[PDB]
Amino acid sequence: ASPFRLASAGEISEVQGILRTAGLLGPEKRIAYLGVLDPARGAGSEAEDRRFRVFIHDVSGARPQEVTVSVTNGTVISAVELDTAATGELPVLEEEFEVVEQLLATDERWLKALAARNLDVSKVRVAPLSAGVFEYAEERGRRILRGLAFVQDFPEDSAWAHPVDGLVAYVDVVSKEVTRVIDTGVFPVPAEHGNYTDPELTGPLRTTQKPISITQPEGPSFTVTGGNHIEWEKWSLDVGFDVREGVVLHNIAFRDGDRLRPIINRASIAEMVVPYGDPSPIRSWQNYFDTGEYLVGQYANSLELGCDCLGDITYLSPVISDAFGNPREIRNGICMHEEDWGILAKHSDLWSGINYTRRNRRMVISFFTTIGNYDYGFYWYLYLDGTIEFEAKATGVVFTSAFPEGGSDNISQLAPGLGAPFHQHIFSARLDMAIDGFTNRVEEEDVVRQTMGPGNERGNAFSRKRTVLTRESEAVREADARTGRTWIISNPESKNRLNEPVGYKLHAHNQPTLLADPGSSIARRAAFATKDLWVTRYADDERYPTGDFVNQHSGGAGLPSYIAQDRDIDGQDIVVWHTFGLTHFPRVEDWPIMPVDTVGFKLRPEGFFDRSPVLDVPAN
Amino acid sequence: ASPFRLASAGEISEVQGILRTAGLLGPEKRIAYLGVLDPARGAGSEAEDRRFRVFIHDVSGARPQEVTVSVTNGTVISAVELDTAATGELPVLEEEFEVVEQLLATDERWLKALAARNLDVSKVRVAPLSAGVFEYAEERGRRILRGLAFVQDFPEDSAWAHPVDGLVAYVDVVSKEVTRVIDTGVFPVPAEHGNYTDPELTGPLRTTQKPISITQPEGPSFTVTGGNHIEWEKWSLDVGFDVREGVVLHNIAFRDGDRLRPIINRASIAEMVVPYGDPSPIRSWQNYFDTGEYLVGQYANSLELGCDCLGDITYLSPVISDAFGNPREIRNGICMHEEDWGILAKHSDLWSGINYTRRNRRMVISFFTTIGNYDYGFYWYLYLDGTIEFEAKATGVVFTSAFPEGGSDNISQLAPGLGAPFHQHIFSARLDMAIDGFTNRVEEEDVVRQTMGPGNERGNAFSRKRTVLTRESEAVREADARTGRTWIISNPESKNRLNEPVGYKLHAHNQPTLLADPGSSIARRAAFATKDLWVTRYADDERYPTGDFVNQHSGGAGLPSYIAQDRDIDGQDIVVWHTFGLTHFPRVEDWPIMPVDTVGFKLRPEGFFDRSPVLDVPAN
Ligand SMILES: [Cu+2]
Ligand SMILES: [Cu+2]
Ligand code: NA
Ligand code: NA
Numbered sequence A, B: 001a002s003p004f005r006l007a008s009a010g011e012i013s014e015v016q017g018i019l020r021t022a023g024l025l026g027p028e029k030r031i032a033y034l035g036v037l038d039p040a041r042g043a044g045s046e047a048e049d050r051r052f053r054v055f056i057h058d059v060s061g062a063r064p065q066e067v068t069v070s071v072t073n074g075t076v077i078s079a080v081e082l083d084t085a086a087t088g089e090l091p092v093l094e095e096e097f098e099v100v101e102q103l104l105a106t107d108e109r110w111l112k113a114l115a116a117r118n119l120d121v122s123k124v125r126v127a128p129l130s131a132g133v134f135e136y137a138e139e140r141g142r143r144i145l146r147g148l149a150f151v152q153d154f155p156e157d158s159a160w161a162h163p164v165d166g167l168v169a170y171v172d173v174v175s176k177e178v179t180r181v182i183d184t185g186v187f188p189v190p191a192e193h194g195n196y197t198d199p200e201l202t203g204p205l206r207t208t209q210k211p212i213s214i215t216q217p218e219g220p221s222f223t224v225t226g227g228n229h230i231e232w233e234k235w236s237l238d239v240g241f242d243v244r245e246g247v248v249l250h251n252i253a254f255r256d257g258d259r260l261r262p263i264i265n266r267a268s269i270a271e272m273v274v275p276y277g278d279p280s281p282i283r284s285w286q287n288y289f290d291t292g293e294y295l296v297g298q299y300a301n302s303l304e305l306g307c308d309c310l311g312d313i314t315y316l317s318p319v320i321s322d323a324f325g326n327p328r329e330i331r332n333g334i335c336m337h338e339e340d341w342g343i344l345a346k347h348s349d350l351w352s353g354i355n356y357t358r359r360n361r362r363m364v365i366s367f368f369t370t371i372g373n374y375d376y377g378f379y380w381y382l383y384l385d386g387t388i389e390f391e392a393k394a395t396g397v398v399f400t401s402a403f404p405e406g407g408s409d410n411i412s413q414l415a416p417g418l419g420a421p422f423h424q425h426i427f428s429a430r431l432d433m434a435i436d437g438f439t440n441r442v443e444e445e446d447v448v449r450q451t452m453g454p455g456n457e458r459g460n461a462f463s464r465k466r467t468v469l470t471r472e473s474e475a476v477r478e479a480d481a482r483t484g485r486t487w488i489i490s491n492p493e494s495k496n497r498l499n500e501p502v503g504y505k506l507h508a509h510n511q512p513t514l515l516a517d518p519g520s521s522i523a524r525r526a527a528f529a530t531k532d533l534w535v536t537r538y539a540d541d542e543r544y545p546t547g548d549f550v551n552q553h554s555g556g557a558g559l560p561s562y563i564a565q566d567r568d569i570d571g572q573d574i575v576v577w578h579t580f581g582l583t584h585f586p587r588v589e590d591w592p593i594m595p596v597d598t599v600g601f602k603l604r605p606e607g608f609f610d611r612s613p614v615l616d617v618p619a620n
Helices: A009-022 A099-104 A108-116 A290-294 A521-525 A559-563 B009-022 B099-104 B108-116 B290-294 B521-525 B559-563
Strands: A029-036 A051-058 A065-070 A075-081 A124-130 A144-151 A167-172 A177-183 A213-215 A223-225 A229-232 A235-242 A246-256 A259-275 A287-289 A314-316 A319-321 A327-329 A334-348 A355-371 A374-383 A388-396 A411-415 A418-421 A423-433 A441-449 A462-468 A486-495 A501-508 A533-537 A574-584 A594-605 B029-036 B051-058 B065-070 B075-081 B124-130 B144-151 B167-172 B177-183 B213-215 B223-225 B229-232 B235-242 B246-256 B259-275 B287-289 B314-316 B319-321 B327-329 B334-348 B355-371 B374-383 B388-396 B411-415 B418-421 B423-433 B441-449 B462-468 B486-495 B501-508 B533-537 B574-584 B594-605
Touching: A009 A029, A009 A051, A009 A065, A009 A075, A009 A319, A009 A327, A029 A235, A029 A319, A099 A124, A099 A144, A099 A167, A099 A177, A108 A167, A108 A177, A124 A287, A229 A355, A235 A334, A235 A355, A246 A355, A246 A374, A259 A290, A259 A374, A259 A388, A287 A290, A287 A521, A290 A355, A334 B355, A334 B374, A334 B388, A334 B594, A355 B334, A374 B334, A388 A423, A388 A574, A388 B334, A423 A594, A441 A574, A486 A574, A501 A574, A533 A559, A574 A594, A594 B334, B009 B029, B009 B051, B009 B065, B009 B075, B009 B319, B009 B327, B029 B235, B029 B319, B099 B124, B099 B144, B099 B167, B099 B177, B108 B167, B108 B177, B124 B287, B229 B355, B235 B334, B235 B355, B246 B355, B246 B374, B259 B290, B259 B374, B259 B388, B287 B290, B287 B521, B290 B355, B388 B423, B388 B574, B423 B594, B441 B574, B486 B574, B501 B574, B533 B559, B574 B594
Parallel strands: none
Antiparallel strands: A029 A051, A051 A065, A065 A075, A124 A144, A144 A167, A167 A177, A213 B213, A223 A229, A229 A235, A235 A246, A246 A259, A259 A287, A259 A423, A314 A334, A319 A327, A334 A355, A355 A374, A374 A388, A388 A594, A411 A418, A423 A574, A441 A462, A441 A486, A486 A501, A501 A594, A533 A574, B029 B051, B051 B065, B065 B075, B124 B144, B144 B167, B167 B177, B223 B229, B229 B235, B235 B246, B246 B259, B259 B287, B259 B423, B314 B334, B319 B327, B334 B355, B355 B374, B374 B388, B388 B594, B411 B418, B423 B574, B441 B462, B441 B486, B486 B501, B501 B594, B533 B574
16 A cells, blocks of 8 residues: 555544544544645655644533554654644644624624624624734634624625624634734625626626537546556656645656656645735734634535546545535545646757657646635646646635725725725645655856856846755745746756756745734744745755644744754755735726636756657547 | 738739749749738728738848738839848748858868868758858848758768767858858767657557547537637637748637637737857857747647647648748648636635636637747647646757866756756747737736835735836836736736726746846847837837848847837837746757757736636536
8 A cells, every 4th residue: 555645534534533532532622633644754664654643622611632642553643732822722623613693692782883884793794704813812722713703695695795894893703702803994895796607797708708629539648546546748746635735746757768767755735824905803804724723625626527637537526624624525526637738848940850749748636715705716738848846726706895085095996885905825845855766955146147248248147046045044045036936946966967966946826925024923933935936955843834733823933943953955855835816906808707827836847857748649 | 801801822923923023023023032911900901901021032142121011902013122231131942051061071071171170071860050240340231151061871861860960060041152161170970869659768658558538529619610710619810821930829808708809919929039058169150040040930840649639630731932932831830729727716615615617718729830940839828717828849859069078067968978058948939919908008916015104004015016117218128027027017007896907917926037148149139139129109110120131130139129219108009028938958868869848928817808708618
């Protein structure tokens, strides 16, 4: 059995049984996170030990625990009681989504605010929102959620159309108390609906779209073995799934002749945060760590054939744990298919008379998740020519507010009285590199402009310079789009046939990084988001750029603390963390449901191969 | 008949007849460029006048002419004798491609250089390369080409594998004289072949690719009427074709309810240049204006069904003129099809219970051209949601040199002894804007970071600032990727239902612009390439950023001279010129034939619509 196989239902049940037998999973306990751990370096031969890590919440007020179990051996490896005021609260539990609204519905201050606005409490939905860390001392060590109100005129109404501005509440979800209700003033509740399946708003549906049929009459060119091992057009990898990160790729390698050459040991989106830029106190605290606080894998959609995934689709249905340790399958949660990708290479040569055209293809591994109003697709692509790409597709319904009478520098108007606060969606890709194996380094490569003069008399020359990042203290880097800045991951001990180090070049989109003031809470809690590229020395406990417990965790842990170790990264087992985000000034076209917009990055081979790796692609 | 229809064979013949009857097209004359002119502003009602512009070369040494004819009326509108030392030489003629090699084959200096290197003259191919303007006074007013030598070991060999470095020659293609032969020293001629259809180099061809079938059982959702008028998913446009620019898009508009709203009046790639960054005198003069010097439309490939264009394809076969004024069809030179484009919009709403998914599509209009060693695909995309995108796909065989013994700061190694000089491929997109009609302006929009303090106590706020470009003197702009800089084209007299000006936002890729020293010849001749964005007032004679006659034209004309008029662009008929390029440090994977790499830009509606324009898209 591959140590990188997906968790099975039975493994989850065994975790549940081990915890129960150990006294760690009584009736007051709730699992907030559960996932398999990756194999240790050098374990491959042989003795598998499948370990699972668990964060256990306690609804009676006792301290939560972090536990690692061996499902192979039926044992508890470690169990530690957590002090959440110090190391952070556990991820938000799905069962807490409804608690915020329920507690507020009987609170006299909340009821007073709603009555002043002539809103029926039974129609008022409350978004259960992560709290962060601000000035409220009573929240330290307590599990808090904040609530913003949205009116549903009827049960199938889009409540996002009807934000209740001027009002926010804070709730202790363990003691089941409402800590604060803040009402700064009434705002009109926007009147128009945003019901994008209502014929009155859509108009007559188009009849002009003729069908498109994508089929594979001999089936797909990729095979799946061992549950999640992919072989496709010389690529080899394993598709993992973690309730926090979502789809994870392991052991990305390329068969070059008859050697299996590693490229990336683990690829994931290790954090994704949505900071808001509206200074109103109703929302200025708002920063949604979709990955670290809510767990994006947990909310993966079941993807329907034809509608969500077009073509010849192979599905994985990953297993996660519910809050009690029972396995739950996410049916059709991962889509895998191969797609045509236009022209790969083409040349019509006058002198030889030979005309040559070849087509490209990509392997696609994706999932789609829903976090409140947001919906995101996470796509990994592998191309015939060795390129690796990630793309996020952001859609859903924009988070709304009132639109202030005199306008706003921090909010867009979408409809009469309806606003959408400015925000960013910022991702961290954690790429545990293995370029031709684990001995790797990173160089920053800039274009170099040259002055007209001796040695360059016509002023045409230009060049490039590479700077080796030798230690972690030197490996916090920013974009420089103007100088074409990229980062090359190479293996200094593996040379191609031209005696040059094999490598892969990371091409970033160079979008803005975190805009918040450097002194803000979010700049400290999401320090990773302030820089485009970080390199660390591999360490099995350094998994997320924000640390293990992001919820209400005050700042510092994660990448800035890892980097302080100032470890050697010059020909060592290293990890690249790439920050990339979308800055979203909402547009009217984003309302009532937003068209997809994208952000991502790609890596291309750079002297990894001895010549083009796609010379053996056939015509047709 | 639409005044924007493609030229017909008969129209070309009529130009030929008008010129002949006027005394302008005798036996010594050769047509270097011929194309229809666009209709004048306000002509639409009615009286069509189809005019064609012609550049006429004279092989006997007489001065060339620029002529405009009316094929409607059978008349010569204007005919002007050109002074090429002042205003530039005419575009390279296809018949001159072979002349450089032929003249050199009997030149004793060339023969001496080849004999020193033991090369058989019959095997030596000579790339016919544009000359530019450097220190050689005798070239002023003469039609010069420069030649670089490549060995073909046999007739179906790839000569690019065997550059002859240290050697360059200059030729007067009218007087049929060799002006200079420069031999700076022998370099080994690289020995390996680059024959990408040789089984010895490809290895056994893959058998792993299973078929992909893309079909449309009811045909495509777009119609073509009037030869080149497209209607597709609310878009309306006309597809033009010009021998210089290639595919051109006219009258891009969107049917919003029952109004046809204009967006872009004319879209084209109005220049594309390839500057080289190797300071060796063998190549330091090298700058290939594929569009302005060679005419990319002229060399458009015939695109084969299945191999070049996959799916349900509708072809246009544009007509151009040969050197004598006879019409010539480029069979299957333009591909049109619609393609699935993944998820358009999706949201799974907990509170309403409604799960909603819709798919996107794009209309694709493309051609592929071959310029010596280079092959480029030009793609225009129209999406359901109003987005417009351009993409260039660069492939072919890299231009080679020797790889110097001690290495090189300006050349990559590809194979033993084989180099590829650093270079850029830099495009200019000329977008004659018509956002809701012709009264337009441009704003530069930057993200604005805000300081923590009063009014922003938590340091989370961020904003945006828009700067109106009021006159052409203010409208030469550079990228600022770090501040998320974009440019919005709006109609200040057309408001959406929220009382905000309708607009489209240009999203650039923010790649490096021209790297050459500002004092270089190429910085002067390709001044457009030094800045990302220019805005001019529309003028029917301001067609190319480099001017009308680029070949051996010394500098200044084009955009820097247009801009000096300092015309009002604040709510006027304006033209956006976007510079965007690929900076190419060749990689071993680019050899022997290069995988496609891409560059481009896109424009998205920004308050153009009153809400999402794709609410009427049906499921499935
Ligand atoms: Cu957003
Ligand atoms: Cu190139
Ligand atoms: Na590593
Ligand atoms: Na215009």
